[PDB]
Amino acid sequence: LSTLETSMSEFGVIRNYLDWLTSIPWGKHSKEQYSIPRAKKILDEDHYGMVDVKDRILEFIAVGKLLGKVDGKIICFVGPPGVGKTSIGKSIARALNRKFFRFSVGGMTDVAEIKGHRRTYIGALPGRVVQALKKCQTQNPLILIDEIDKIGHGGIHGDPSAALLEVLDPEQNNSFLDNYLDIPIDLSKVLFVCTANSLETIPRPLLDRMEVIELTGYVAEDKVKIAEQYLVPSAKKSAGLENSHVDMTEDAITALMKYYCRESGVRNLKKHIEKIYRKAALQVVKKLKINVSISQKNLKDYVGPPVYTTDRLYETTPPGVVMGLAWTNMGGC
Amino acid sequence: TYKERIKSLKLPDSVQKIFDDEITKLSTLETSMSEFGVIRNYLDWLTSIPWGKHSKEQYSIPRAKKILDEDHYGMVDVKDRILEFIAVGKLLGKVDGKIICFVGPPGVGKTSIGKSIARALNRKFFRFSVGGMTDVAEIKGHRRTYIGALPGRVVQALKKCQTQNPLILIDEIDKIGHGGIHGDPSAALLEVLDPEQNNSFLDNYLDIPIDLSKVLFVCTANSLETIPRPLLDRMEVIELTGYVAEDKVKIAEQYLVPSAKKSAGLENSHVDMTEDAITALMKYYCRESGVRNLKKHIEKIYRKAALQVVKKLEKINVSISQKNLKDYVGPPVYTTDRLYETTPPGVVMGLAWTNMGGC
Ligand SMILES: Nc1ncnc2c1ncn2[C@@H]1O[C@H](COP(=O)(O)OP(=O)(O)OP(=O)(O)O)[C@@H](O)[C@H]1O
Ligand SMILES: Nc1ncnc2c1ncn2[C@@H]1O[C@H](COP(=O)(O)OP(=O)(O)OP(=O)(O)O)[C@@H](O)[C@H]1O
Ligand SMILES: [Mg+2]
């Protein structure tokens, strides 16, 4: 560049390359946390009972405390929808004192979004991993691959699944070898987190490189605990409704579990609580005492009189009938 | 050229730094090569987005209710939902973009209610019809390296509205082409329609993320068994039950007859249609749940009336009553005559449900 002029495009190519090289955090790392109780606390103030993930993070901190190298593994989360397999990422990064970056891979089907293009092209840019490293301005970040199952296994003009498998190599990760940044880059410190629903879609070579943690859904008791601890206060706050007035009783939440929400996630529960407090806010606006009571006896006025209870059940079994069990998405049957 | 907008839109900090770096790059660039052209296009796309301007949120319940009720009759659920949305927005001073889906038989009015909702909420309306996509390019866009690189239709919709917090009406969700390899727009919609990921849309053409947490996404589908469970989990579905015969008659007499008469050239001048004619047309011609074929029948009747008025050039007003209805809309086609006057042994009358309705 010292012998280049702005007249020809060589100067532009070289300055773009230099800017990309100097933007990448080549040597600076993040300050790892060494306080296990502090990390446990900061993990327990956002989610209720995801015991396996919290134990994994605590073990990560403990093993990092016994060395000076912060090794980044490939943790992978699989579970039913609405179990918080994506919302944890931010809290996990906060607990690990790392910078969080989310990388959605839902519709991406070209390797140019992973490896980029050569400098020969007019508008070539590096992949999203290098851009994530540039945005974080630090090594060992927390890159959350938001959709592993929904890639399509590649069609034509690119096979992104193979490129991602090249990125997520537990041993040969120190040389990513970006196509645009044409020299190897150390990805062995980055922490990679999945967000997946079905394990039968990921190819076996890619699945073999990832440590999978099964994120089982929530039981009805865990559902009411999650509601009363995080969802009811948040839904109440998201519509004003602050000063010592309308709230949902415990029997109302129990009836909501028993008759309206039998799934594994807590998203439909969020919808029901949001609609209850939305109707309460509408009533408050229309009426301009200020206390409104919501309980079991008046719950089928807010979430709708329709319910979800049949229980099937013969009062007394005649000879020939036998009651077995079956597994369904809506709890059991 | 680009300074006035970026001054007047109050863009976030990260995009401000990106824009500053971009103009620093352009200062050393010249028109001779295509680098200047692609940079200018990138800056034009970046400046087009209404980064920090919103609309005036609705604050009056009665006027919003009257705006809603002047174009549709029976959607009490949708009107109640909009009223609750306004009430919630009033108590906070801010607004949140909720995701809502409409499901029902064709003709109930899922697509038309979107414009009325947007007008009541004082939000600019954009309708995105996505029935025929096979690729994600229309949702996430293409990288600027490619010559045929255009942002996703969400970014283009935000530019067209020229104001954030719009109402984006997604016309079809059932017709979404799932296909296989070469693209899957369903997961792209999952990314777009995530209630907590709206802050990091991260379009391909614009590497900087954009905020979609204020957009009021309104979807529309006919069935619910085709949509993937992850997509359906993040959507709030409202069922639209088909109209009853009395409801259809009221909808006709209050909105369809005046509109068809106005658009047929006989507006409030000569021709009227009796209630008995409406009831007969409902019972013998239009037994469905929607009001599309009923509207077609009324428009045909009024077109024939206009032709008769023009050619003819008795009574002062022309009546289209039940007795002379068959000479305007043809013979009845849905007569019920397969019944039994006296049921013989072995025969039992049952009931059935179809898309048309009861049987
Ligand atoms: N165990 C939990 N404790 C507290 N909140 C939870 C828990 N699981 C989920 N939530 C809450 O439920 C909501 C939805 O969670 P989220 O968006 O992370 O779902 P998900 O499991 O990642 O979804 P999907 O599989 O569809 O991608 C969030 O508000 C999240 O905080
Ligand atoms: N309640 C109503 N009041 C007045 N007009 C109505 C009402 N419901 C439906 N219509 C009219 O009936 C027609 C239905 O068209 P519209 O596109 O709104 O239906 P849709 O159910 O959304 O259609 P599709 O499923 O084919 O997309 C329109 O002309 C609309 O104005
Ligand atoms: Mg009209």
Author numbering:
A (entry chain F): 554 to 841, 896 to 940
B (entry chain E): 529 to 841, 895 to 940
Question: What did the original publication write about this model?
Answer:
An adenosine triphosphatase associated with a variety of cellular activities (AAA+) serine protease, PIM1, modulates mitochondrial DNA copy number and maintains quality control and respiration. Of note, PIM1 from Saccharomyces cerevisiae is defined by a unique insertion of approximately 50 highly charged residues between the ATPase and protease domains.
In agreement, ATP-bound PIM1 subunits interact with substrate via the conserved pore loop 1 aromatic residue Y674 and hydrophobic residue I675. The organization we observe in our PIM1 structure is consistent with the proteolytically competent conformation, where 310 helix is unfolded to form a substrate-binding groove and the serine–lysine dyad formed by S1015 and K1058 can be accessed by unfolded substrate. In PIM1, the conserved α-helix is followed by an ordered loop extending to K1120 and ending with an α-helix (A1121 to K1129) that is unique to PIM1. Situated at the base of the protease domain, the C-terminal helix is stabilized by intrasubunit hydrophobic interactions among residues V1118, W1119, F1123, I1125, and L1126 of the C terminus, residues F994 and A1028 of the core protease domain, and residues L952 and H953 of a loop at the base of the core protease domain, hereafter referred to as the CT helix-interacting loop.
